[PDB]
Amino acid sequence: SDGDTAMKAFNDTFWDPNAKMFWKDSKREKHQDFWVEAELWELVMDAYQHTSDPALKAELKTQIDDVYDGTVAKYGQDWTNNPFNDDIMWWAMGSARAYQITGNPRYLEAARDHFDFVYDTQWDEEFANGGIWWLNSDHNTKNACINFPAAQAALYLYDITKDEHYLNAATKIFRWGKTMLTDGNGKVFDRIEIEHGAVPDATHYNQGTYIGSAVGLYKATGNAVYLDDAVKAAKFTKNHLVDSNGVLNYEGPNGDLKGGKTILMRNLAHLQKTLDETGQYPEFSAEFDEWLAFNIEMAWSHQNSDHIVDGNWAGQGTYESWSSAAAVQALNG
Numbered sequence: 045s046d047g048d049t050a051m052k053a054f055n056d057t058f059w060d061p062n063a064k065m066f067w068k069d070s071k072r073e074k075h076q077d078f079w080v081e082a083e084l085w086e087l088v089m090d091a092y093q094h095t096s097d098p099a100l101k102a103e104l105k106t107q108i109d110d111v112y113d114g115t116v117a118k119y120g121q122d123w124t125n126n127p128f129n130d131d132i133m134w135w136a137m138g139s140a141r142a143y144q145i146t147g148n149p150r151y152l153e154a155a156r157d158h159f160d161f162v163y164d165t166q167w168d169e170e171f172a173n174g175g176i177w178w179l180n181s182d183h184n185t186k187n188a189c190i191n192f193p194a195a196q197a198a199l200y201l202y203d204i205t206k207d208e209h210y211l212n213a214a215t216k217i218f219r220w221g222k223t224m225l226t227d228g229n230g231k232v233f234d235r236i237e238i239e240h241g242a243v244p245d246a247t248h249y250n251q252g253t254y255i256g257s258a259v260g261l262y263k264a265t266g267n268a269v270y271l272d273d274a275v276k277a278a279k280f281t282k283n284h285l286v287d288s289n290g291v292l293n294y295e296g297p298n299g300d301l302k303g304g305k306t307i308l309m310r311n312l313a314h315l316q317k318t319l320d321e322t323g324q325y326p327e328f329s330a331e332f333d334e335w336l337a338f339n340i341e342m343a344w345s346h347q348n349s350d351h352i353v354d355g356n357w358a359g360q361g362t363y364e365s366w367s368s369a370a371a372v373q374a375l376n377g
């Protein structure tokens with residue numbers, strides 16, 4: 045029931061049925077940013093997968109289509125005019141997932157066409173020995189927020205198509221990212237800037253997409269090193285991106301980072317499932333599961349009377365859809 049209650053409340057508060065987009069906040073004066081809307085799209089999909097209520101499930105399935113339609117009405121179907129490669133990839137990944145749920149051809153075409161644009165034209169071997177550029181306008185930085193999502197998108201496309209091209213892409217992207225965008229022990233760096241080098245600033249959403257791509261690669265390849273990779277990044281997160289009580293911390297005021305627990309929780313659930321199922325890392329798995337449950341209970345204990353939880357999970361007017369999404373995500377894992 046809790047995942048259902050959380051998603052229903054989130055939609056009540058933030059879904060605009062007229063524009064078929066989420067509102068950016070409860071003042072209902074601006075719709076959500078393009079990239080973030082893909083992440084809310086995935087939240088709808090996660091609720092769809094999680095729920096056991098057939099009425100709600102059908103409504104959510106329709107909503108999957110409506111989110112795409114509202115975005116296409118405002119932004120078009122061809123996102124390759126957007127200078128942000130990450131923006132394109134977040135939508136390509138969401139589209140791959142929407143295809144898996146609905147079977148609608150438009151989503152497979154969207155996923156494959158946009159993934160190909162970014163991977164085939166924005167990968168470069170010269171600077172930093174590999175990696176995808178953040179932007180398709182200026183080529184000054186290669187970032188975790190494009191590279192790990194690209195590996196994830198490739199893994200979904202591999203699953204759908206069985207075309208080894210996509211598994212090879214995921215493997216290549218992830219190898220580069222582990223080598224150049226992490227410390228080797230689970231701390232994921234934000235980016236590498238040309239003429240500077242690595243910027244070793246870790247954040248929830250980049251831990252998350254690293255963990256999700258590692259878990260996906262473990263499953264696709266049968267190579268246990270990838271599971272180990274995921275575990276080390278989860279451990280880092282649990283010990284180093286938390287407050288003194290172990291609650292995942294608040295990354296405001298940056299608007300993009302504020303809601304990043306949403307992406308983190310989505311991907312921590314993949315690891316949780318794989319550890320639970322396989323029985324690997326049983327000691328860590330038990331600790332991890334207890335810590336996840338603790339975080340979820342603390343976050344929800346801060347819900348307001350409308351069952352909305354602000355993204356500072358350590359505390360208490362206007363609520364924002366990105367920051368409020370993480371608590372909903374956490375109950376739909």
Ligand SMILES: CS[C@H]1O[C@H](CS[C@H]2O[C@H](CO)[C@@H](O)[C@H](O)[C@@H]2O)[C@@H](O)[C@H](O)[C@@H]1O
Binds near residue numbers: 234246298
């Ligand atoms: C719009 S994507 C763009 O910005 C985000 C956040 S910039 C923010 O966080 C970083 C990580 O802690 C710091 O390095 C930076 O100084 C700011 O405080 C970033 O994650 C993306 O890689 C990209 O730069």
